[PDB]
Amino acid sequence: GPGMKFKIDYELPLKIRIKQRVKHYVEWQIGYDMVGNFIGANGKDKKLYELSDIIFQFFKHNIILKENLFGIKNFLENNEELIEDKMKINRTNFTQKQVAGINFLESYVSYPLLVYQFEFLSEIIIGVQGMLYFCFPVHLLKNINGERNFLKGYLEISRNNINIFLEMLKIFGILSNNHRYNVLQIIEFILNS
Amino acid sequence: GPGMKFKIDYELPLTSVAGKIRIKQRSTDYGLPVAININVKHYVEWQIGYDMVAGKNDGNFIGANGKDKKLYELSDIIFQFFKHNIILKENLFGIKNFLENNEELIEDKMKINRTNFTQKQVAGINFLESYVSYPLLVYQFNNNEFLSEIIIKEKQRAIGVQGMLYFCFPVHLLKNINGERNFLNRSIESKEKGYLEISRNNINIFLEMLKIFGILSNNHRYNVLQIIEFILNS
């Protein structure tokens, strides 16, 4: 349907990993671009993909207002608090530890992780790099025919859950400087188009 | 040379990435990798093994996993120095009796920790923050130049933790192709090889490393015990 009736049945092959803690969920290492619509932070030909493809279509069908994209743009342009700079890896001081009578020095390396709850949730784990994972129960997916008969999958996106992907784009925009630059280029492309 | 003069100039590929040999710089503690003149803080990181899967003709023992195995790197070094009568039989027997009586295993005592959550706000966005803490064990050999570090990670597709042993020592200890220790204050040439001199003066470092492998897990204990028995009966 057009306008507010617009939906996307996103095909998900079964970057996709299936794990379990009804406890089984989809682990989607979702991206926003692909190697053209804009110039990435690395200076390569980048085009819209996945997350940005979803936002562009729902903006094209007038479900996402341009005022929302303007607010996200100004938020990402004005913000200086980035997740990569706020997530610090900690290393403890070496302490004496004996195993099997052998004297070792023991230290712990702690890697932070962030959980954003939207039932959906986003997880950011950790040279090193931060990796974003969009997670949701697997029984939410419709089969190839079009019914949740799992308890290829298809994730239904509509006006009732598009805000999950707008929030996820905003989170990407504060993950790192490279992501902040790329997301700003994507929002500029969507607003101009 | 012959007898007590026996040595091994172990060839180590220096300019190589995505392999068992890596070059890092020790930050006065911890170290960070490097890609360039070599100074005293540059170390060799060697993810050394003690065996290798063998074929139907070159097998030396059967490992804990039931696979054909043969000597490799650490165990081959110990075999040659035992073959040339530098390593005493009592040294191998002492390690054998130690591994037979030992009950504390590294993969059973080392724990990966997940901390409680805390509320964390970044850019005005509220998150739940937690930490995953990985232990590492460092063993300082009697020679203050050599050390080994055991990194503890999760078992892949299994329950528990696994240890990866790395053998570390300064780059300036290595000899070039001419037998010169001239790496200090000099950049490493392309495809250049470093040579770690192993002799009677430092062989016990490799014996202590074999003992450390033997306490890593029950499978490692079994494999080391099979290696000691094979070497003793040679």
Numbering used by the authors:
A (entry chain B): -2 to 11, 17 to 23, 42 to 55, 61 to 143, 147 to 154, 162 to 186, 195 to 236
B (entry chain A): -2 to 25, 28 to 34, 38 to 236
The authors write:
The R.CcoLI structure was determined at a resolution of 2.35 Å using the crystal of the R.CcoLI(C189S-D225N) mutant. R.CcoLI consists of five α-helices, fifteen β-strands and one 310 (η)-helix and forms the characteristic HALFPIPE structure using strands β3-β2-β5-β13-β12-β11. In this region of R.CcoLI, three catalytic residues of R.PabI, that is, Tyr68, His211 and Asp214, are conserved as Tyr52, His222 and Asp225, respectively. In the R.CcoLI structure, the insertion residues of R.CcoLI forms an antiparallel β-sheet (β6-β8-β7) adjacent to the active site. However, in the R.CcoLI structure, the side-chain orientation of Lys71 is flipped to the active site due to the insertion of the R.CcoLI specific antiparallel β-sheet. The model structure of the R.CcoLI-product DNA complex shows that the distance between the side-chain amine group of Lys71 and the C1′ carbon atom of cleaved deoxyadenosine is approximately 3 Å. This result indicated that the K71A-D225N mutant of R.CcoLI functions as a monofunctional DNA glycosylase and that the side-chain amine group of Lys71 is important for the DNA cleavage activity of R.CcoLI. Although the structure of R.CcoLI was determined in the absence of DNA, the R.CcoLI structure is most similar to the R.PabI structure in the sequence-nonspecific dsDNA-binding state.
The most striking difference between R.PabI and R.CcoLI is that R.CcoLI cleaves the DNA backbone at medium temperatures, while the DNA backbone cleavage activity of R.PabI is very low at medium temperatures; R.PabI only hydrolyzes the N-glycosidic bond of the recognition sequence at medium temperatures. Both R.PabI and R.CcoLI are members of the HALFPIPE superfamily of restriction enzymes. Structural studies have identified that HALFPIPE superfamily proteins are not restriction endonucleases, but rather are restriction DNA glycosylases. However, at medium temperatures, R.PabI acts as a monofunctional DNA glycosylase, while R.CcoLI acts as a bifunctional DNA glycosylase. R.CcoLI is predicted to recognize a negatively charged dsDNA in the HALFPIPE region, similar to R.PabI.
